[PDB]
Enzyme design. Structure first.
Site, mmCIF file in Angstrom:
data_model
loop_
_atom_site.group_PDB
_atom_site.id
_atom_site.type_symbol
_atom_site.label_atom_id
_atom_site.label_comp_id
_atom_site.label_asym_id
_atom_site.label_seq_id
_atom_site.Cartn_x
_atom_site.Cartn_y
_atom_site.Cartn_z
ATOM 1 N N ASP A 96 -23.616 -32.420 -31.227
ATOM 2 C CA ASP A 96 -24.464 -31.803 -30.205
ATOM 3 C C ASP A 96 -24.908 -30.370 -30.574
ATOM 4 O O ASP A 96 -24.796 -29.449 -29.761
ATOM 5 C CB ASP A 96 -23.807 -31.877 -28.810
ATOM 6 C CG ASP A 96 -24.783 -32.004 -27.653
ATOM 7 O OD1 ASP A 96 -25.999 -32.161 -27.910
ATOM 8 O OD2 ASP A 96 -24.331 -31.959 -26.493
ATOM 9 N N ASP A 140 -18.870 -26.067 -27.441
ATOM 10 C CA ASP A 140 -18.818 -27.429 -26.912
ATOM 11 C C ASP A 140 -18.484 -28.484 -27.976
ATOM 12 O O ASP A 140 -19.378 -29.087 -28.582
ATOM 13 C CB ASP A 140 -20.120 -27.767 -26.148
ATOM 14 C CG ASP A 140 -19.929 -28.597 -24.891
ATOM 15 O OD1 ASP A 140 -18.998 -29.454 -24.870
ATOM 16 O OD2 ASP A 140 -20.721 -28.416 -23.934
ATOM 17 N N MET A 159 -21.499 -18.701 -13.744
ATOM 18 C CA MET A 159 -22.478 -18.268 -14.746
ATOM 19 C C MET A 159 -23.366 -19.412 -15.250
ATOM 20 O O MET A 159 -24.401 -19.147 -15.866
ATOM 21 C CB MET A 159 -21.851 -17.477 -15.912
ATOM 22 C CG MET A 159 -20.505 -17.963 -16.386
ATOM 23 S SD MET A 159 -19.668 -16.563 -17.167
ATOM 24 C CE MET A 159 -18.523 -17.366 -18.071
HETATM 25 C C1 LIG Z 1 -19.835 -16.860 -22.076
HETATM 26 N N1 LIG Z 1 -20.601 -17.859 -21.617
HETATM 27 C C2 LIG Z 1 -20.228 -19.113 -21.961
HETATM 28 N N2 LIG Z 1 -21.071 -20.109 -21.644
HETATM 29 C C3 LIG Z 1 -22.263 -19.938 -20.824
HETATM 30 C C4 LIG Z 1 -22.381 -21.060 -19.810
HETATM 31 C C5 LIG Z 1 -23.570 -20.837 -18.882
HETATM 32 C C6 LIG Z 1 -24.861 -20.705 -19.692
HETATM 33 N N3 LIG Z 1 -26.018 -20.551 -18.784
HETATM 34 C C7 LIG Z 1 -27.212 -21.334 -19.129
HETATM 35 C C8 LIG Z 1 -28.216 -21.233 -18.007
HETATM 36 O O1 LIG Z 1 -28.561 -19.872 -17.734
HETATM 37 C C9 LIG Z 1 -27.400 -19.108 -17.388
HETATM 38 C C10 LIG Z 1 -26.358 -19.149 -18.481
HETATM 39 C C11 LIG Z 1 -24.776 -19.619 -20.775
HETATM 40 C C12 LIG Z 1 -23.536 -19.826 -21.658
HETATM 41 C C13 LIG Z 1 -19.063 -19.357 -22.738
HETATM 42 C C14 LIG Z 1 -18.316 -20.468 -23.263
HETATM 43 C C15 LIG Z 1 -18.629 -21.932 -23.067
HETATM 44 C C16 LIG Z 1 -18.125 -22.468 -21.722
HETATM 45 C C17 LIG Z 1 -18.437 -23.940 -21.595
HETATM 46 O O2 LIG Z 1 -17.860 -24.686 -22.669
HETATM 47 C C18 LIG Z 1 -18.416 -24.277 -23.923
HETATM 48 C C19 LIG Z 1 -18.114 -22.824 -24.209
HETATM 49 C C20 LIG Z 1 -17.272 -19.935 -23.956
HETATM 50 N N4 LIG Z 1 -17.310 -18.572 -23.889
HETATM 51 C C21 LIG Z 1 -18.388 -18.190 -23.145
HETATM 52 N N5 LIG Z 1 -18.735 -16.930 -22.835
#
Ligand SMILES: c1nc(N[C@H]2CC[C@H](N3CCOCC3)CC2)c2c(C3CCOCC3)c[nH]c2n1
EC number: 2.7.11.1
Length: 272
Positions: A131, A149, A26
């Site tokens: 951050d 994070d 993702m």
């Molecule tokens: C869902 N998506 C998540 N993180 C995603 C990571 C990919 C991002 N991209 C950006 C670029 O475009 C496509 C999506 C969108 C947020 C998380 C997390 C994060 C995991 C990493 O450590 C910090 C907490 C916890 N629970 C989540 N549930």
């Protein structure tokens, strides 16, 4: 926290499929997992990667709030399993990534309030995030803001290893200072992103840095109305100006002249 075996996580992420979902990947590596009918976010972890893993568990164990992402478990080859956030990040939603509809002004106020509630918990529990950015503000099924994070999080002080995101950092944060007042500056940039729908940094933009629009508005070259995200139909002038007033205060160049997270929280409550 649950101690997951590497095989439990290898299986639920379809052998850690590195191809985008439209696979299991993702973003950056974060994969989509399915543990006991429940969807999970599995983060699979230039040698400080092992160092970040320890700091995140430590902060997550102590910090549990409705406006902070919940860590479900870990594995030890190193993995971190979180509560899945179906609406991704504030950054992705403000840019309307993958054809998602623009966030309403109403939704945007609730996210600002929620994100501030999460930062208020962190500062009450003597933690500095370091951050704060829209990429680190995730959204659940109800678009509830969740601060994520905590790898760079820390429990008047100076460091030799300056960390964070340049476009969101306070002048003193860039100088090596560690203070919760730096998190307030970063939130001011996030409020500007919520108001404008513009990224904090764009190399093909004048100004390149979003925080520079504060000076453009103060030197009466442009107005906040000129910068308001045009992808909204419910943004009333009064509450947008009220959010820009909070953002302007947050972005004060002098740390002691910025409001505390309690005052930011108070001003955002008054806005609605
Ligand atoms: C869902 N998506 C998540 N993180 C995603 C990571 C990919 C991002 N991209 C950006 C670029 O475009 C496509 C999506 C969108 C947020 C998380 C997390 C994060 C995991 C990493 O450590 C910090 C907490 C916890 N629970 C989540 N549930």
């Amino acid at each position: 926290f649950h101690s997951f075996s590497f095989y439990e996580l290898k299986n639920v992420t379809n052998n850690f499929d590195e191809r985008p979902i439209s696979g299991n990947k993702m973003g950056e590596v974060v994969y989509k997992g399915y543990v006991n009918n429940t969807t999970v976010a599995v983060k699979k972890l230039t040698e400080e990667l092992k160092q970040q893993f320890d700091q995140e568990i430590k902060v997550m164990a102590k910090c549990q709030h409705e406006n902070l992402v919940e860590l479900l478990g870990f594995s030890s080859d190193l993995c971190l399993v979180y509560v899945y956030m179906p609406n991704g990040s504030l950054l992705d939603r403000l840019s309307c990534l993958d054809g998602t509809p623009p966030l309403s002004w109403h939704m945007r106020c609730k996210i600002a309030q929620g994100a501030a509630n999460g930062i208020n918990f962190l500062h009450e529990n003597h933690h500095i995030h370091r951050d704060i950015k829209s990429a680190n503000i995730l959204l659940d099924e109800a678009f509830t803001a969740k601060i994520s994070d905590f790898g760079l999080a820390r429990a008047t002080v100076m460091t030799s290893r300056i960390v964070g995101t340049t476009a969101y950092m306070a002048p003193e944060a860039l100088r090596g200072e560690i203070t919760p007042k730096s998190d307030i500056y970063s939130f001011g940039v996030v409020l500007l992103e919520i108001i404008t729908g513009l990224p904090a940094v764009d190399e093909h933009r004048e100004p390149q840095l979003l925080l520079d629009i504060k000076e453009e508005i103060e030197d009466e070259e442009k107005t906040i109305e000129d910068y308001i995200d045009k992808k909204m139909n419910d943004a009333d002038s009064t509450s947008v100006e009220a959010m820009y007033s909070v953002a302007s205060q947050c972005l004060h160049e002098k740390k002691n002249k910025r409001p505390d997270i309690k005052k930011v929280q108070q001003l955002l409550q008054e806005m609605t």
